[PDB]
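pasting input
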Amino acid sequence: DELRVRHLEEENRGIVVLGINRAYGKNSLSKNLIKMLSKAVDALKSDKKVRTIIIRSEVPGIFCAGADLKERAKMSSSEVGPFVSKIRAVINDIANLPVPTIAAIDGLALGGGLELALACDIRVAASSAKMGLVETKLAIIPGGGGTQRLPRAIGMSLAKELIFSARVLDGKEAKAVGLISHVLEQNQEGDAAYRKALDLAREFLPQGPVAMRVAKLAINQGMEVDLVTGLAIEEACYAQTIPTKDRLEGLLAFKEKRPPRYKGE
Amino acid sequence: EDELRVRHLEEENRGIVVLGINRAYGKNSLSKNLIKMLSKAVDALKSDKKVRTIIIRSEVPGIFCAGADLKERAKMSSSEVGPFVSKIRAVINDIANLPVPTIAAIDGLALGGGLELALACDIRVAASSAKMGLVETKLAIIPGGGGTQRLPRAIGMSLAKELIFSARVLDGKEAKAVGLISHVLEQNQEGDAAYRKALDLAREFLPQGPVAMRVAKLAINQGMEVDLVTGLAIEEACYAQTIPTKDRLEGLLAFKEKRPPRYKGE
Amino acid sequence: EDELRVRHLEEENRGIVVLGINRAYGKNSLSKNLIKMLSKAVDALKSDKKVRTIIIRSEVPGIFCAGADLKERAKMSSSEVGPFVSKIRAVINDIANLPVPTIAAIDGLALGGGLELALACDIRVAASSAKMGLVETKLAIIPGGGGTQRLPRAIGMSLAKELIFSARVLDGKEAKAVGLISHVLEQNQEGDAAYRKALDLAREFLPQGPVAMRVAKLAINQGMEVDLVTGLAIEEACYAQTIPTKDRLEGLLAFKEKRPPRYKGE
Amino acid sequence: EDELRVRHLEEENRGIVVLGINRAYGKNSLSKNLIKMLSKAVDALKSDKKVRTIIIRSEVPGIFCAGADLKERAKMSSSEVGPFVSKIRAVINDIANLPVPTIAAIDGLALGGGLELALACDIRVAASSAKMGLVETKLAIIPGGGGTQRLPRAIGMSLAKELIFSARVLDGKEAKAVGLISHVLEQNQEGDAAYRKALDLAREFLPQGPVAMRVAKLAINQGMEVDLVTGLAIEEACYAQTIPTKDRLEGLLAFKEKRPPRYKGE
Amino acid sequence: EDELRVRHLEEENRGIVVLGINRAYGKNSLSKNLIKMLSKAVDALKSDKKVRTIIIRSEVPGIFCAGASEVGPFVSKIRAVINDIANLPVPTIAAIDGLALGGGLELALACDIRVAASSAKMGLVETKLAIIPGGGGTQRLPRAIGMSLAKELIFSARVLDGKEAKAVGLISHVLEQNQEGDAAYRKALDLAREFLPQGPVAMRVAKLAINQGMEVDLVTGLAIEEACYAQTIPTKDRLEGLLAFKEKRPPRYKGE
Amino acid sequence: EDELRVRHLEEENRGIVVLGINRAYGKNSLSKNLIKMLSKAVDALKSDKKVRTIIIRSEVPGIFCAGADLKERAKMSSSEVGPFVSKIRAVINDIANLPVPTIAAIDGLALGGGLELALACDIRVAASSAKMGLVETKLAIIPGGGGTQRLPRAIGMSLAKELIFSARVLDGKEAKAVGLISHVLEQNQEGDAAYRKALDLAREFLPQGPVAMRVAKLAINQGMEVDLVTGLAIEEACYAQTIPTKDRLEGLLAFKEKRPPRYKGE
């Protein structure tokens, strides 16, 4: 129960929420939480109905504090490398989820915590939330992919400044450097970011499921190769939409001037 | 065929060429006829040795390019769609490879293939009231004119994903905020503030050495698709091409005699 | 020679090494001799194990670096141009590969090779009145010290092209708006406000684990030159360098005791 | 249906899993259903802790896999060919990425997609009378299951190009001669010579430490995708994974007590 | 001077184009004109859409092609033309019936396939001249026979005959020389004729997929294969292929 | 310590340096003291200007290098293992980066680190009776001295995987058969047949231009870790370095006076 997987219903049908529930250990990335997060992600990776995934915390004021420093203290040096690589690998699995992913940051997101959010496609946070990669202050470096993703998200100059200074930014500041896409004033219940994430996710729902997946594929893979190859990849992804019923439905709904009803095929 | 006009401006705008889309009835949609014409016009400019800057814009107020000609698309068999969309992607790419600076003047709606055509230009300027976006996913398809590649490279993966995922339309002001365009302007009563702004920016390019401008664009486009070590080698090669030119000497001579340089592109 | 001073700050700023260009008589231009000493200071700083942060600044008020020494360039023959320009490009790349955080304090004019030099630093700070840009095209050539590669990578292709195509010069305020610099502050009566902000920022880096800081810059720089999967493997190798260090343990100890860590760089 | 059999062996074969194609009516062609089943079996096996080696074979005499189901390829329209061929390319790539040692036992015909599947395994063994080749160019298409990529990497470009250009079918003896397979066997009365050799080979793998076998494969596969300097770092990270394992200690313990090691895969 | 003959075979070998070097008065050495013509001829074929296979041979018995601030520029010209040969759109075969040294062997290494008489000689002896292979040999040799053997050959500047070149994988086919001295060429034609029946569009993108895919990581190579495959999907030849297989007859491709 | 003898042959072998391992009591195992000496000797040789070829062999009959010292490893703390293994990997890598041609003469057992050290040499020669292989996986670890990277690069992914997975040992005959060594020969009464062939091969390198040999190895090693376009660029630079040498002219001059070249490495 430290990791809750909720498959929403009603107007939110198609939306899945991964909630970290370890208020006792500040939602830190323990061997067990990593184990379940990995199982959840692996299961979702091949889930039919899923149209959008939101990753958030069910603990007020905290998203994910990162590495379980208690455990790290007990860990012998020979065990540190392998464990941190396990974390790096699960976060990369999140980055490769087939559908749109949104991280709802309503609390502290440090180290692995921010790196996890960096693995999502879009980040939204409260203006009061705190985030940063403070690893160099501990004489280590971001090991969950941060040295790689932060720079690709906000440019090397800003990424280096944040990693070199181990600075902690608030929502407003994170928004200013583009670390996040939407900043929200926190509400009484403390789920303002989550609320924004749910709305954004509902804004994704009506789109063609196959098109959304191949679009994410084209963008993610396209950005890893040169432009010419990226264009060929786009062609291949576009080809996946051509023989779908949905594409036809899109046209039919247009002829009948009615809203499309996509099935994901 | 007058759906695409190519005007070689003169006098104060000598050097600037303008490609104007004129398909009001089709909302400047990318019909097969239009792509061929644009493809034909693009291939001619790739050889023109007088052009110093190209501006792409609309002749029809309120519209830039609504993208795909769906009515013509609805008549296309499944086996025709792929080849045709690729044709569009390839022509937009040829535009992206134009040898000289290109500017997209967005004074109206730029959707799908329209915005994609805009992304192929080096610089985009738009009216604050202009509307643009990639709505493909609402039709169970995806941007097919290079949009899944050029949007992320232009505004970053996170914003590109949100825009494509949501199939959201943005106005000039919102586009300036996410960095989709470089200049936003309040629309004028003629409905061509963006075009006027494009002309002003273009004239700002006219004075520089033609060869340098060409190799500079080549260095930037090619270098951004390889690693830095490779890109630096590309820069050295591009720089080498300006060394034995008459214009470089003219630049030092002009600087010596304290006077405006008058380059010839040689 | 007093053309380039290398001060290894003391006490409060122990670990900070300042590099100051001093050639007011030549606008700090990148002369044949100047890059020679620069290359010398860089090759040294590179192997220096005591440095934690390097700041590049000018000791000449109102001037950072005007670029290549134009007076000597006019005297250069066509065959000596390429080699020389390449030397500058290489030394600037050597600055881009310095082992520790580098900061460019711009309290004056930064043109051509001068701005390129600053682009080679991790972070750039400037006074609102500081001037900078790549004007090479107005001289029928192109930026040749890595500018056609580093500018687009820092501010994006569209903005980079516009600046190079128009050979536009910007002030600190504008540079900050396009993301060319990370920090902008109003100048002071001493004309060293940038140098001051740089020092303050540098001190912010000092408390961090020395080994971690080095492999972190290594991870970022090398990771951005390859695809993400390879990038992740590079992060893994860098991280592995901090695991067996005494500083790592001191980090966990200091966190536990609620006190400032005292890293020794091992 | 029962077209794909997944057999978890027992006794002196426990740890060995066998995936057997069983579609005699379609010459074990890669139909929509076989790919779906193949894909689910592979995905399941990827997270199976108990597996130490996987063998891919045919339970149909004289036939390994004829490749594409031409009865279906003729049925589907053009727009459906691309996505389907890519599906096959993807499932074959999933097989190449299985975490444990994989062996392809070729006791029959392996054409196009069939051979490509075999190329996805770590090791290939075949009967001297078995026939294999990528004859796609004779059908006016090219190997679509990864063959243009895996064949050249396995036997070199010159030989791969000759096989693909000529669309030649080789027997096990000739396949061995060009390095396409590692072991060639004289076929037996039951027609399972290749398989028998594959089983013996798999048994040679079983006694080794499971975690070590997995990271060894990871080090080799990924190390070959990057430059050597990066590959060595990946080796270190993979080696580091064996250090804190109980099996490594057992290895040492067994050496002192001078006896056969008994690994648990942890 | 007709130093380079471009024979456009027909009938039985229609689609095959032979490039014969004829300069026995220079042992087919790479001279200014040879390189200029050779280059001009490659540019011609490079864009020819009727050619299905190109064979590079020597019409001077016993010899294939010997070796070759001014030096550098001219060495890069040869390297550049050899690389252009490496980029020809259709299958290329090097028929080695004579001596192949320096740029000569590097020329053959730029072809897709190499055949040679067991008596023919070849090697990269630049080191004995205090210089190194400058026509790509240092890159293409290692990639063809492996690093260790490549280095041994270049470090020792050893010369090998067809029988040896075959055992180290330098060539794909070796054969006894005939009385006419064109056994290699004879094999090359036989091989080239083996390619002729295949779909022209598929053959070309297949070479593309292979050449380009080997220059990147496998995942990228897979995307390149997908794109190349896509080019064959809408072709009439693809349907002719299926048609021919159904009627159990030989395909008649048109390259479209 | 005489654990490692460095001989600078003279007369008919002048220009050849032999690094002979002599640690019979430990089976030439890679002890911490042995690598330091090895590292010391290798670092020294990379500075030597007279060396033209380096041969690595054993001064003990029947043994090349048994790899890791299990007695010194059994007393190794889990936290010491990683750094130590990495130290071996690094020293074997420095051997691979030796500027002059290297040859491994295997006249006996070459296991683990021993075979990996041999893999770092450009050329390997072995006696028919010499045994070699990477048996790490039988100890629940993996080749940690570059084996997972160099073996696949030397004999292909499929053969390397089988050998590492099965952890089997091959004799010289079989090693020759799979391409692991370049020359195999019958052992002689003294048990130094491999060493003899290595000498005969080394003397075959002596007569070539020192500078060319050095740049040939650089072009090939560095060229094989990048794409062909880059590799060809590297070749153009390595070639350029022999153009202005006194040796290049001596080659032409020697060829002029029809006499044997007498290079001096300049």
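fyi Chain E touches chain F at residues 71-72, 75-76, 79, 83, 126-134, 136, 138-140, 142-143, 146-152, 154-158, 215-216 (CB under 8 Å).
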